Symmetry: C6
Subunit: 61 residues, 6 copies
């Protein structure tokens, strides 16, 4: 986690808009509210739990 956690934490603390690309090709957008070992809590109009196993890539918007 020596790279993943710092990467997600900096986006979380700064409240950067991010794009989360899922394996099926769908792109989600919002702010990272928090995360744990298996999930990311992504907030836009509502708070959704995204399973990391479904994510291909995370990048600031």
């Amino acid at each position: 986690q020596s790279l993943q956690d710092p990467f997600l934490n900096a986006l979380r603390r700064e409240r950067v808009p991010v794009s989360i690309y899922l394996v099926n090709g769908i792109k989600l957008q919002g702010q990272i509210e928090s995360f744990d070992q298996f999930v990311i809590l992504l907030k836009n109009t509502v708070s959704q739990m995204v399973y990391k196993h479904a994510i291909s890539t995370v990048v600031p918007s």
Copy 2:
């Protein structure tokens, strides 16, 4: 841990949820219960949903 308190608040307050599967299909219902690998999603009857097949869970 963020997963379990998130699913518990939906379970206890019997909140209606959308579960999106990795193929894009949206399922809807109430979280009857969950464990390490599955979620039981009730409408009239419960179906068993494998977490490995879920991309997102969001209220309503």
Copy 3:
């Protein structure tokens, strides 16, 4: 484990169940048996279905 009760119930009742796979395939039959990683589904054939390929199990 919620899987065992959920699946043992179906297995004993021999009721029809739909198994939806992660690729969108819908299988229809009876739950004949299961273990940690597979489910044996019975219709005109008995086929061994890997749980990793399953999204949902839905009583008919």
Copy 4:
């Protein structure tokens, strides 16, 4: 419970040389006989032996 079902099911097919179909999650159907398997792979023989990863397999069924 563990491998109670999987391992006898595959062992029966192997022992009796039953022609099998293995459906991959991508939809592709493989056919042949199961010559052996371990924790992660199944060896399938048609004209030649190919190693199939269980992680890619959805269903196994007699042809």
Copy 5:
């Protein structure tokens, strides 16, 4: 472990890489860094790619 040397070699020599994903998508850039589960890919932006989503890593 073959991953570390392979990926580090590509990091040290600044090699432009293609990261193919399991779903057909190609990402292109340089390996900025990596850990057990992710690879950081730098092109115009720095993106974090989950290894579970990657099929292959190759020079462009």
Copy 6:
């Protein structure tokens, strides 16, 4: 156990192989090395292939 002897015989004997990915793509070359998680495949270029993305390995 079956996997390691299978792959080692292809590596040691430098046998041309075909590696099919879960999206159906066929890669070709020789296996230089492999570990728990990856296979290094040599053709014109050396590429790393994640085992989780492979469906089938067969001599070509």
